[model samples]
Target: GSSGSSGKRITRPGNTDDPSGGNKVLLLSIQNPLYPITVDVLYTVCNPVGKVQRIVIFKRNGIQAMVEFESVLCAQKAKAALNGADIYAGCCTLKIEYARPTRLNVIRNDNDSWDYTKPYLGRR
Candidate 1:
């Protein structure tokens, strides 16, 4: 007897489900020295919405930082609004991504995700 048949279902991609608010985690990259004052300046430049949780730069470089928000929608808004801006009083640029531990939703986590966690802090 040969009854070879498998049944299953698939799920959609790109979803958010955060009870906090509606914003995304943003990755703002700059090219300059890092300092408290500079970070604060960058923060002001950000003007993110939906409550930005954490805004940390990369090591001492301080040019780039990861912004954690309450929602994905807000993150997208920031990306759309301030994707390209002069930062740190120098020729700098900005990029937005999720604050996620992996490639998952760096913006929010709750819905569903196929993105798996990468090993050992996602850094170089």
Candidate 2:
């Protein structure tokens, strides 16, 4: 009995069913922060997914953010691809889930939030 065989599948966080299913907003939980996470960092990560409409960063219990994409498809794509991905190799791991809100409201374009739809809202 020297034959060794195993059949298993690797599953990550967002690889399964999503609660917010078709929403255009994604709530991200970033873990193990080595440095301050800003809207710029969020943009770099999310922009690859699609055209980001808005980004809002906040602190409740831990570091969290709400990212709004141009469409639901873009949101879904971001969730599926970025869930459980690390921002800086071993740290700042991302947990992506569909947020309840279909859109995010960004009043200002500071380090906390930004609205890509408006080019003249932020600082010059």
Candidate 3:
């Protein structure tokens, strides 16, 4: 169904509740990154909304991170709080949405990938 369908329902950006925040997750698209954004940066920005359960930082189309929170309500709160907030000095913008995948396949290293985990300690 690739219409960004959430099983039976189809959801879109700014729709926030991409179906339970799509399993209590928020998808982030970092608009600009002069350098690699760190976990600390993400933490400083994302914490206090809801304890971040897991974060998957990756580079494909652009710098993107998937954040899973304690609950959908938390995701909603985080989304409402963090979306469009500048990362640094009002340049790095965050466009947050609900990730389509229920769970992210996070690869800490090149060896293999595993399910999402919090406080990502490996390197980029």
Candidate 4:
């Protein structure tokens, strides 16, 4: 059998109407990250958009995060402004989308996850 050159992959454009209708939680996809993506990093990036209530960064298929804002307006703003924006000068691009979960659950307060609404939880 002869091996042939593979064709270029086809990637479809993502939906523009995600997180439909005032969703306060956002799903963030971090790609080409130059540094370790932490809860604080997510907070800093999202803070400018609005008041961040909680943040959780998990590694599934890749580096993915969930951020909860104080209001839907803030969530919308974050998605609109930060989506497709780079976290650094030329790396760690952020892909913001509406998350299915309305709120984030942070059981422990640590570098990777935290809940601003419950500061008393402390680091474990």
Candidate 5:
């Protein structure tokens, strides 16, 4: 595919948003209070970041998510660009930061393993 319409440069960053300060794990916080962002919307907003391996959304001090990328370079770039960007005109701004050691398990079991080759896991 081609580059996105956002027209933003997607470049790699150094030593940021990594789980070990060396791995790809970003902790994102949606500061917007009113908007109830869903898993669907989250992907749309962050996919531009890079090849997202996985994302685990949960509520902790508002709505927060852990985005896993294929590489630390990918995560760093995404955080630099997407952080503080809003999905809408008023709210849903993302606050990006390096995540501490965490268990960001998105799939419940082996039966639910994600298939990146299939969009939406081929449900449609």
Candidate 6:
């Protein structure tokens, strides 16, 4: 709640053994670009990035994700290649840090319905 540890950041190594397995790669296209990255993005970015260990979608305006590698050397590669680089097609810039994204439970539905909070007549 109050940030995290002092020196080290907590992370879960995502790999074939992970329930999400290759889903980490897909977490790059979250629309909210705020709190939590969407599942669809997670479903696309993982595995391809090599055993996704820890990935963080920074709550920035441009949607940045700081992903880690299970292999430290691999992490180095990603850090080198991704740092100051546009990962999601120039959607955002990557930043190297000692942290990753956290997993959780989220319920979502893919339906485009008009907002009733204001005023709506029909679903058009």
Would you list the C-alpha lDDT of every candidate in the order shown?
Answer: 0.51, 0.81, 0.69, 0.81, 0.67, 0.40
TM-score of each: 0.47, 0.77, 0.67, 0.76, 0.65, 0.34
Better of 3 and 6 by lDDT: 3
Ranking by TM-score: 2, 4, 3, 5, 1, 6
User: Candidate 2 at 106: error in angstroms?
Assistant: 1.6
Question: Residue 18 of candidate 5: its Cα lDDT?
Answer: 30
Which lDDT tens digits does candidate 4 get at residues 9-123? 8788985665345588888888887689898887887787778888888888889988888888777778887888777888888988787768678767778788887787535
**What are the per-residue Cα lDDT tens digits for candidate 3 across 31-80?**
87776776556766888666776676777888877777877787877898
Q: List the residue pairs that clash in candidate 2.
A: none
Instruction: Give me the runs in candidate 5 sitting further than 4 Å from their true place.
Output: 1-22, 107-124
Which regions of candidate 1 deviate over 4 angstroms? 1-23, 32-37, 48-50, 60-62, 88-90, 98-124
* Clashes found in each candidate (C-alpha, N, C closer than 3 A): 11, 0, 0, 0, 0, 13
The RMSD (Cα, Å) of candidate 4 is 12.3
Q: List candidate 4 segments past 4 Å from native.
A: 1-21, 122-124
Off by over 4 Å in 2: 1-20, 122-124
Error of 1 at 76 (Å): 0.7
Q: Residue 29 of model 1: what lDDT?
A: 61
Instruction: Report the number of backbone clashes for model 6.
Output: 13
